[PDB]
From a paper:
To study proteasomes derived from the dormant state, we ruptured spores via bead-beating, in the absence of ATP, and performed size exclusion chromatography on the spore lysate. Using 52,679 particles for 3D refinement, we obtained a 2.8 Å map of the 20S CP. Here, we use cryo-electron microscopy (cryo-EM) to study the 20S proteasomes isolated from dormant microsporidian spores and identify a pair of PI31-like (PI31L) proteins symmetrically bound at high occupancy within the 20S central cavity. The identified PI31L of V. necatrix, a small protein of 147 amino acids, fits in the available density. Two PI31L molecules bind with their C-terminal half (residues 76 to 147) symmetrically in the central cavity and occlude all 3 active sites in each ring. The resolved C-terminal portion of the protein starts on β5 and β6 with the two shorter fragments (76-89, 96-107), connected through a disordered linker of 6 amino acids. A short flexible linker connects these shorter fragments to the continuous density corresponding to amino acids 113-147, located on the opposite β-ring. There, PI31L blocks the active sites of β2 and β1 and buries its C-terminal end in binding sites on β7. In the β5 pocket, PI31L bulges out and loops back in on itself, resulting in Phe101, Ile100, Ala99, Asp84, and Leu85 representing P3, P2, P1, P1', and P2', respectively. However, PI31L appears to evade digestion via structural constraints caused by Pro129 in the P4 site, which serve to push the P1 site Asp132 out of the active site and into a region where the angle is suboptimal for nucleophilic attack by the active site threonine.
Residue numbers in the entry:
A (entry chain G), B (entry chain D): 2 to 234
C (entry chain N): 22 to 215
D (entry chain C): 6 to 224
E (entry chain F): 2 to 235
F (entry chain E): 6 to 230
G (entry chain H): 7 to 224
H (entry chain B): 2 to 229
I (entry chain A): 1 to 225
């Protein structure tokens, strides 16, 4: 029993128990949503603990490289570790490629670097989940990856606590040709399906990305209006 | 491997390393031997471990010549002692190479003690084994004075006027505290040491189951059976 | 080559010629010598063509790397230092760079062949620079406007082109300011016809 | 545990290797000043199995021969290292390796696999044998111990054979070796071979005589 | 069976060994760091285990470089490794760029060096809470690092056993337009407010300030500067 | 489960780091007293047998520097060699004497490495370094990787009685003279060893260090007999 | 040789002469100097013939693994960077100069790569022994062009090198990479026409066989 | 477990590896007057490619039983080592050299603690001193020479039949294969019932060839008729 | 004890079986179904794609190309397949470097299977948890975690493999119709109505292997309906 629990090996059921446990650790983390339409990428997530002595702005969306961002959830230390590893890989791959690396290449590289932690014993697999996203030659692209070392091209990712409810909402309402404001509403509603529709705006952050500019965060009043619109209909 | 190295280096709640405690049990599971120091001479007598009489007495030697004026007797696991002897010879020859002189016996003891507990070190010449050596050594030599040294598997060593190792160590010590006097001649000293040895030998003491090394200012003599015959009576 | 860098009232202005040559033959006459390190840092390469390209390719990723680790605009100082180590650690690489940019204030850094890094208010380099040291010394004025500095670079590089055989073609110029980078172009038609 | 002491001060894996070296086909030998007689017994349950020669030469000009008891595949590696030691010593030094040096270096090779983790003791009692100037037989333990033997036996139930040899002080070493082997083996179940190693020459003894002498023991 | 044999996940996703490390860290001596526009200070309890120790010459605050210094609670010897590696990395980084290491770079180094202990098998979690105070571009920031490697910037922070009582007092505290000596006064007062004599031994105070009056250089105050305050709050 | 190797037990402590505290208590007593001008080492040495020679627990690192330790003697000898090498390097390559505390920086880093990872062996030696550096300074080195300055300390078997005897008089060390410090060290040993005859002219070796002066071994006749 | 490269509005034209030489002796006729790198990238090189093939083969591997892995047609900048990172460490001992051209999602790109690892984005290029003869035609005739005019300017450029350079001759290979894909014209022209020499036959009796051994394939 | 001894003085991992072999497809070998028969029984119709019998060099062939992955790994290793021998001394090695290569690697893998034994056995057909030979190698690495041997399913039954049912008479490999089929059918009917899973090699040192199932059925009719 | 990185995670049980290899085979067997059908004119290869997690089915691919003549698809965990795909691309590119031709199916499968098997003997490593179908040169090979390969006429990997394999035997035919025949065969083993987005198809015709575009898969389904 303990042989399969501890080591990164297949149990009699055909699953690696350690990866499942890391996935549980991720699932217990804060909720986060990244969702994209034909023209923009929208990401919303629950803000971290509101310490009164805080002297920082703590965002779950981290720029990794020019026109390349990440939105990860899980253990704060593991999320930071994978962000720094992604920056390392991005700069190395940009050196090798002759051009700034794009989100797809970086997701593939990061997952291929995470896989050895899944196939071998000695190093703990980081407990993280989220999407590396950005704009690739004018097209918004979102790639989802997590502790299990998978990498898929996705319209969006819903990670963290109660990610299944967020998925159920988003898939029901989401579409690619959805409008920008409707994309905002769908993403924030998917998040609220985890947080609860009665949550106040101070509890979560929203940012959006457009082709020619940096990632931008919605203002407090903007989030108030967005939540009022979502609750209205 | 890390697990095996940790098993080597684990400390006991009482203090001493577990491996050292086990090596100290192994160190006296062998035939007995006595070392006597006098301001003129140092003796070292050991009963041979003749498992069968078909095993010729000549080839079961128990004293190894470490250098021009250093001899090494041992008790316990005899396999480790040839490695210890080889590294001691290397140390002595290196010391002569650097300084053109015969090393002090204390310097060889210091070198061996340093090498003893270096299980972890990755270079062979900077350690003896990956574990304590399962042998207790009586190292004698002449360095402007007859010197008798005992090296334990714990890496500790002490200069002695007289010591006994092997299964008869305790009995021979309880006899030494009564019988030993350093104001005695070398021939009478040989008689006394052989008398003490015969007390513990499984069979009757003779010149073919006994090996004697006597190091003096003049020679590092190893006594022939025709010479041990003089002292057996 | 004739690479030039002048710091003026509100940013950096770098000028360069277009000619690249091997011997008496001009292998290309449209070479871009103003190498972009980042959106706000530009490098004027001089020395071995292959080695200076190798450095600027590495400095490009190093300055971006640290920029996102630090979470701030890329630092022209860090790019210049990163260039100095490579130029110093590898004597076999014949490279000398003018690295000029705008992170918080305009800065010009000159890395000589052996890795000697100095901060300058104006800097020139390349084979053709030898012929405009007196012209640049007498004509330089602190805190020029864009038009005054553009004339200064235009005059200096033009006089280097008219004298240095390894220097020729139109004068590429690029003004890095806090507002961004604006490229200029002084066609050789005007320079040669005069 | 591997390459480490047990709570009672025992190298457990080394003694397990000793035991594994005891669970092997019995080999018996006896020597005089100018010759050695070496006898080996083998299981004949398989008629289709062709019995391998267990007396292999280490170096033909030095007239050194090798025999073993225990895990057969380990014997291949140990014999290969014996031959390599002889050849490398002649390359490096320019002179033939002495028998004692070969025994010492082979014993060091044996010990090597008991000083380290991640590796398993050979677990074979290996016999070095030479007749150039005088008969000399070395028996190397799996743990690296080695010492000369005038006569002895190794392998399955060899302790009883050594006990018998202690008493069987007969002048003819052929008699001694074959009779000592006969104390254990069964003529119906065990096919037996006997060799006499002489000055730079080798030959095996007649089956009739060996069988006749073996029949008189353990009747 | 609990899977705490190594730094591995339990069936609920928790890494038990990191929890044990946090238990060890939360039982260390308290250190308080308070940051302000005018400067930065850190207070450190130094319990008198025996009067034989020369407390005035044993320092809890370890400098990473001229502009970064840090203090730890828990198994404070782990700070030896953490500080040595941080110093080796950041001195080289500073002098290879001829400019100060930024707060974010220090945070990156802290997190990446602390995480590998929570990430490998034959390794033991760092088992300390760590406060790292630094100056960069004429700004001061305090970085409180947990055993997980999670490190956040704070306006004022405390580690050690008495953190629970000190944190509320800090939350009651306004730092804007406080003089550095006001910070010293408040820090000593809050430290003594969490003494709990019946459970903790008497302690000496180690105070290190980093303010304009010393052009941002780390200065370890001598006892005569705050003996009056210690007498006031003993 | 948690006893065998380096990991936190559920209560949050590493058992091996506690076991090394028992390990460092094996050796014979060393009693150290420091005054700004001079310092004293007092040791108790017992022959392991009637025929064993004394082990000379105190080692001089350099003129005006003494080191002594309790516990595994191999680690103590390693530390003695380390301190000698550091003295040579600091005198030559840095033009100064070893700093009593900072000379232990590399050793503390190595010890911390050992306490953080398995496979590597924890140091089982506790050392006292008495050296003249801007005055006499006494340093206690612990196997956990920390070196701390002390007014006086006792290491080895039964050292707690010596420690409490010293601690009852620590505030007066700066006023005591050399004879007074030697007397207090012998008193601490006596409190640890109240059995008469055990402490004698042969079993106790006293080492004196005075600022701006060489370190010397002085006869114990005047203080025990 | 006269390998030439011309960039026009929506693609590139890479032309080359079909000749190889070792000293004053022509070694290979109809030699194909345009090497495959990708469906949208072709490279033509001058220098050590073995180094051109192997350097362009390394780029072909790295770009094939990239496109297969990421399902994304490679960029010309990726090909040039791979070549630069390979040529530079050898300090030019691997003597390979390339004219890499292709069409990516960013448009048409044409590069000059030199043995020491330097690269240069260009509008038109000539390389090899006939570069000077070719570059003279490109200088005079180059402008903003379509593929038809780019085809003839490049072919006229090669023709000049074939006619005026001793070590250039035989045919003209042409390869156009446009946004619609690459299309090849092997032996696009036969400017180096040879004479119609008759055959010459020895009598079979003119050679004597000393001994003969016959072996059969199985 | 791993590669370590036990109180019984045996490598349990090697014993389990040897046990694994008996679950593999049956392979048989027999030395005859004019050659060596190598026979293998596949689990499926496999005319696409030979799978039970392979070639090492112009004068060594091997049969396979046990773990297929390890078997192919060491088959490739043995082929590479035979080619290295040819590179060294400019002539092809005999059966003994291939046996030595594979046995050395197998022993290395049963002696290294952090690895597992190879779970397969080989039968080597070859020549030495101008006389045909038939060796074998177990997972332990032991080399056994045989007049005849069997491994895989029904290994013990076929081995017993060879022990006491195979005539001691020297015979050419035609009658050798006839007798092999006789004893195989006596042990189990499935051998004489079906033939499309068979791989049979008529090893001659210079002109070895494989038998078509038409030839196998020609043997089958002879065995069917001889008893009538 | 903490994780032993030097441990051999694959060993024979007392029953002669490899414990971890069977678990890896079980893990592979749970993957999404994928099939291949050999024909007298070529070989078809089809697999199903899960539409969950908002995966862009148009961009997500299940059938991959190794060389112009080889294709591959898997059942099992994706990361292991991605690593094995990197390995296979390395193999094919190395062969093309040496010989300049497209790697033959059998040589590729052999060189690939040996490196797959490497992990059943590598210390501290578990075998890949993926089954692989390799289509090329008018042949099909199924490669399992053990590193054992078998050429096949009709093969299935993933869920419902045995019964689907039996159904494929009932659903063979000419390559042009075999595509629709096998699409019908695998329509019996999908949890929801299959759109063209949900299936990848790769067909080896003549001398090359090509993966159908999403538009082509619509054409195949238009024939189905």
């Amino acid at each position: 029993s303990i042989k399969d629990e501890i080591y990164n090996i297949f149990n009699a059921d055909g699953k690696i128990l350690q990866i499942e446990y890391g996935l549980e650790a991720v699932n217990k983390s804060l909720p986060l949503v990244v969702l994209k339409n034909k023209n923009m990428i929208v990401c919303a997530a629950k803000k971290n603990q509101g310490h009164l002595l805080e002297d920082e702005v703590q965002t779950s969306f981290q720029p990794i490289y020019p026109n390349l961002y990440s939105a990860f959830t899980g253990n704060w230390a593991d999320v930071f570790y994978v962000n720094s590893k992604a920056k390392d890989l991005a700069h190395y791959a940009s050196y090798k490629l002759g051009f700034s690396v794009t989100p797809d290449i970086l997701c593939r590289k990061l997952a291929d670097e995470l896989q050895p932690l899944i196939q071998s014993t000695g190093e703990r697999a980081p407990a993280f989940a989220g999407a590396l996203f950005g704009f690739d030659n004018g097209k918004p692209v979102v790639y989802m990856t997590n502790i299990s070392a998978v990498c898929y091209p996705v319209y969006g990712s819903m990670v963290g606590s109660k990610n299944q409810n967020m998925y159920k909402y988003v898939e029901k309402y989401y579409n690619e040709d959805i409008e920008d404001e409707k994309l905002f509403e769908v993403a924030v509603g998917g998040l609220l399906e985890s947080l609860g529709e009665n949550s106040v705006y101070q509890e979560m952050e929203v940012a959006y990305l457009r082709n020619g500019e940096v990632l931008k965060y919605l203002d407090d009043k903007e989030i108030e209006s967005l939540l009022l619109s979502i609750a209205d209909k | 491997s890390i697990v095996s190295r940790q098993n080597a280096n684990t400390y006991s709640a009482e203090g001493r390393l577990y491996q050292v405690e086990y090596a100290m049990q192994a160190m006296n599971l062998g035939t007995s031997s006595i070392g006597i120091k006098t301001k003129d001479y140092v003796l070292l007598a050991s009963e041979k471990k003749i498992i069968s009489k078909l095993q010729n007495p000549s080839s079961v030697k128990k004293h190894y010549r470490v250098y021009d004026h250093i001899a090494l007797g041992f008790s316990g696991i005899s396999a480790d002692v040839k490695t210890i002897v080889d590294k001691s010879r290397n140390f002595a020859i290196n010391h002569e190479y650097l300084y053109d002189e015969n090393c002090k016996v204390e310097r060889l003891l210091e070198h061996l003690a340093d090498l003893s507990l270096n299980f972890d070190k990755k270079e062979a010449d900077e350690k003896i084994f990956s574990r304590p050596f399962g042998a207790s050594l009586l190292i004698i030599g002449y360095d402007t004075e007859p010197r008798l040294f005992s090296l334990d598997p714990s890496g500790s060593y002490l200069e002695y006027h007289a010591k006994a190792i092997g299964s008869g160590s305790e009995v021979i010590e309880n006899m030494l505290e009564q019988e030993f006097d350093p104001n005695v001649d070398i021939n009478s000293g040989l008689k006394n040491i052989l008398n003490m040895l015969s007390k513990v030998m499984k069979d009757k003491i003779n010149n073919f189951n006994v090996e004697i090394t006597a190091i003096t200012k003049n020679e590092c003599k190893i006594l022939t059976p025709e010479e041990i015959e003089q002292f057996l009576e | 080559t004739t690479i030039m860098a002048v710091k003026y009232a509100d940013g950096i202005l770098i000028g360069a010629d277009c000619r690249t040559s091997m011997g008496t033959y001009v292998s290309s006459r449209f070479t871009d010598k103003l190498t972009k390190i980042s959106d706000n840092i530009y490098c004027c390469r001089s020395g071995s063509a292959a080695d200076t390209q190798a450095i600027t390719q590495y400095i490009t990723e190093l300055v971006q790397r640290s920029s996102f680790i630090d979470k701030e605009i890329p630092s022209v100082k860090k790019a210049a230092m990163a260039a100095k180590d490579i130029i110093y650690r590898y004597p076999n690489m014949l490279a000398g760079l003018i690295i000029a940019g705008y992170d918080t204030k305009p800065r010009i850094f000159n890395i000589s062949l052996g890795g000697t890094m100095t901060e300058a208010e104006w800097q020139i380099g390349g084979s053709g620079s030898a012929y405009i040291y007196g012209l640049c010394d007498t004509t330089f004025k602190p805190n020029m406007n864009l038009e005054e500095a553009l004339e200064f670079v235009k005059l200096a590089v033009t006089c280097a082109i008219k004298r240095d055989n390894a220097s020729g073609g139109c004068i590429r110029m690029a003004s890095i300011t806090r507002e961004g980078v604006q490229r200029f172009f002084y066609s050789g038609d005007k320079i040669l016809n005069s | 545990a591997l390459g480490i002491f047990s709570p009672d001060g025992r190298l457990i894996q080394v003694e397990y290797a000793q035991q594994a070296s005891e669970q092997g086909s019995l080999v018996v030998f006896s020597s005089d000043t100018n010759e050695i007689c070496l006898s080996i017994e083998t299981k004949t349950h398989n008629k289709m199995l062709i019995d391998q020669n267990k007396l292999l030469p280490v170096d033909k000009d030095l007239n050194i021969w090798y025999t073993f008891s225990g895990i057969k595949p380990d014997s291949y590696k140990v014999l290969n290292e014996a031959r390599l030691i002889c050849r490398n010593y002649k390359i490096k030094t320019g002179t033939n390796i002495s028998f004692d040096e070969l025994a010492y270096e082979l014993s060091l090779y044996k010990q090597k696999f008991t000083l380290d983790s991640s590796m398993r003791p050979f677990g074979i009692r290996s016999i070095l044998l030479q007749v150039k100037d005088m008969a000399k037989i070395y028996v190397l333990e799996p743990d690296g111990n080695y010492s000369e033997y005038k006569c002895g036996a190794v392998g399955q139930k060899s302790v009883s054979v050594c006990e018998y040899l202690e008493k069987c002080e007969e002048e003819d070493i052929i008699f001694r070796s074959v009779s000592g082997l006969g104390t254990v083996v069964q003529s119906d179940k065990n096919k037996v071979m006997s060799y006499v190693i002489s000055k730079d020459e080798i030959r095996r003894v007649e089956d009739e005589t060996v069988s006749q002498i073996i029949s008189t023991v353990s009747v | 069976a609990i899977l705490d044999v190594d730094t591995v996940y339990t069936n609920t996703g928790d890494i038990l060994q990191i929890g044990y490390a946090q238990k060890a860290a939360d039982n260390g001596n308290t250190a308080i760091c308070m940051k302000n526009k005018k400067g930065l200070i850190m207070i450190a309890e130094k319990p008198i285990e025996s009067k034989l120790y020369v407390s005035e010459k044993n320092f809890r605050i370890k400098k990473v470089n001229n502009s970064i210094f840090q203090i730890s609670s828990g198994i404070e010897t782990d700070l030896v490794y953490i500080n040595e590696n941080l110093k080796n990395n950041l001195i080289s980084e500073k002098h290879s760029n001829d400019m100060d290491v930024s707060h974010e770079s220090v945070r990156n180094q802290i997190v990446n060096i602390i995480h590998q202990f929570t990430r490998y098998s034959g390794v033991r979690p760092i088992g300390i809470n760590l406060l790292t105070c630094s100056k960069y571009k004429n700004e001061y920031k305090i970085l409180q690092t947990d055993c997980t490697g999670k490190s956040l910037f704070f306006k004022s922070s405390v580690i050690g056993k008495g953190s629970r009582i000190v944190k509320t007092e800090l939350e009651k505290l306004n730092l804007e337009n406080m003089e550095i000596r006001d910070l010293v006064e408040n820090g000593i007062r809050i430290l003594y407010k969490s003494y709990d004599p019946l459970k903790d031994k008497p302690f000496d105070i180690e105070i290190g300030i980093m303010c304009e009056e010393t052009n941002g250089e780390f200065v370890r105050l001598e006892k005569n500067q705050y003996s009056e305050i210690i007498e006031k709050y003993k | 489960d948690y006893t065998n190797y380096i990991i936190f037990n559920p209560e949050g402590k590493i058992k091996q780091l506690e076991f090394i505290n028992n390990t460092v208590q094996l050796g014979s007593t060393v009693v150290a007293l420091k005054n700004k001008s001079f310092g004293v080492f007092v040791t108790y040495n017992e022959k392991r047998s009637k025929f064993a020679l004394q082990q000379k627990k105190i080692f001089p690192i350099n003129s005006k520097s003494l080191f002594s330790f309790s516990g595994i003697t191999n680690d103590g000898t390693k530390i003695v060699k380390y301190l000698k090498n550091s003295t040579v390097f600091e005198n030559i390559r840095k033009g100064r004497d070893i700093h009593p505390i900072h000379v232990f920086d590399d050793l503390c880093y190595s010890a911390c490495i050992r306490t953080l990872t398995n496979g590597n062996r924890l140091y089982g030696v506790q050392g006292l370094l008495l050296t003249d550096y801007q005055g006499i300074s006494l340093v206690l080195f612990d196997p956990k990787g920390s070196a701390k300055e002390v007014r006086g300390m006792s290491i080895g078997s039964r050292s707690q009685s010596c420690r409490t005897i010293l601690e009852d008089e620590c505030d007066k060390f700066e006023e005591y003279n050399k004879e007074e410090l030697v007397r207090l060290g012998i008193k601490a040993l006596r409190n640890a060893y109240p059995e008469t005859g055990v402490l004698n002219k042969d079993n106790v070796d006293i080492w004196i260090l005075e600022t701006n002066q060489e370190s010397k071994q002085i006869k114990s006749e005047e203080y025990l007999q | 040789t006269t390998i030439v490269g011309v960039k026009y509005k929506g693609g590139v034209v890479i032309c080359a002469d079909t000749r190889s030489t070792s000293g004053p002796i022509v070694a290979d006729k109809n030699c194909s100097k345009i090497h495959y790198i990708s469906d949208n990238i072709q490279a033509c090189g001058a220098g050590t013939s073995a180094d051109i093939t192997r350097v362009t083969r390394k780029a072909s591997k790295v770009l094939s693994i990239f496109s297969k892995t990421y399902n994304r047609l490679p960029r010309v900048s990726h090909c040039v960077r791979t070549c630069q990172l390979h040529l530079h460490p050898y300090q030019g001992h691997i003597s390979a100069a390339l004219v890499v051209g292709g069409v990516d999602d960013t448009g048409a790109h044409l590069y000059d790569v030199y043995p020491h690892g330097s690269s240069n984005s260009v509008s038109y290029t000539a390389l090899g022994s006939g570069s000077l003869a070719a570059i003279s035609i490109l200088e005079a005739g180059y402008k903003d062009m379509n593929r038809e005019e780019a085809m003839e300017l490049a072919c006229a450029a090669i023709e000049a090198g074939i006619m005026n350079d001793l070590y250039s001759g035989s045919n003209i290979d042409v390869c156009v990479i446009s946004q619609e894909g690459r299309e090849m014209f092997r032996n696009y022209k036969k400017v180096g026409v040879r004479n119609e020499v008759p055959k010459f036959q020895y009598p079979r009796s003119s050679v004597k066989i000393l001994k003969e051994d016959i072996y059969k394939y199985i | 477990s791993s590669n370590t001894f036990t109180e019984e003085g045996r490598l349990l991992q090697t014993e389990y590896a040897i046990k694994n072999v008996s679950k593999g497809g049956t392979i048989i070998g027999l030395v005859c007057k004019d050659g060596v028969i190598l026979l293998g029984i596949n689990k499926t119709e496999l005319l696409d490619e030979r799978e039970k019998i392979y070639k090492i060099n112009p004068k060594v062939y091997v049969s396979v039983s046990g773990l297929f992955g390890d078997a192919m790994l060491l088959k490739k290793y043995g082929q590479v080592k035979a080619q290295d021998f040819l590179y060294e001394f400019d002539y092809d090695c005999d059966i003994d050299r291939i046996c030595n290569f594979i046995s050395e690697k197998k022993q290395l893998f049963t002696q290294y603690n952090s690895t597992r034994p190879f779970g397969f056995s080989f039968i080597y057909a070859g020549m030495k001193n101008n006389k045909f030979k038939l060796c074998s190698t177990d997972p332990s690495g032991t080399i056994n020479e045989w007049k005849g041997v069997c491994f895989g399913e029904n290994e013990d039954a076929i081995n017993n039949g060879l022990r006491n049912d195979f005539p001691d008479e020297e015979m050419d490999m035609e009658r050798g294969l006839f007798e092999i089929f006789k004893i195989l059918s006596k042990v189990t009917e499935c051998s004489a019932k079906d033939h499309k899973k068979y791989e049979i090699l008529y090893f001659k040192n210079e002109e070895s060839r494989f038998l078509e199932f038409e030839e196998i059925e020609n043997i089958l009719l002879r065995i069917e008729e001889e008893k009538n | 004890m903490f994780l032993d990185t030097h441990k051999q995670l694959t060993l024979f049980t007392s029953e002669g079986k490899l414990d971890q290899c069977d678990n890896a085979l079980k893990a592979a067997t749970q993957g999404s179904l994928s099939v291949g059908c050999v024909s007298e004119n070529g070989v078809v290869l089809a697999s199903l794609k899960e539409s969950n997690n908002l995966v862009i089915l148009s961009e997500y691919k299940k059938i991959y190309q190794i060389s112009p003549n080889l294709g591959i698809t898997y059942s099992g965990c994706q990361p292991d397949f991605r690593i094995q795909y990197n390995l296979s691309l390395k193999i094919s590119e190395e062969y093309t470097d040496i010989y300049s031709t497209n790697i033959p199916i059998r040589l590729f499968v052999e060189q690939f299977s040996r490196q797959i098997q490497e992990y059943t003997i590598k210390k501290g490593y578990r075998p890949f948890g993926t089954l692989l179908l390799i289509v090329g040169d008018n042949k099909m090979y199924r490669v399992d975690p053990s590193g054992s390969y078998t050429s096949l006429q009709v093969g299935t990997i993933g869920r419902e493999y045995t019964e689907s394999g039996r159904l494929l035997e009932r659903r063979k035919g000419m390559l042009d119709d075999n595509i629709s025949t096998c699409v019908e065969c695998i329509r019996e083993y999908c949890g929801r109505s299959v759109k063209s987005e949900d299936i990848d198809i790769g067909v080896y015709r003549g001398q090359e292997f090509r993966v159908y575009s999403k538009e082509e898969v619509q054409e195949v389904f238009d024939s189905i309906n």
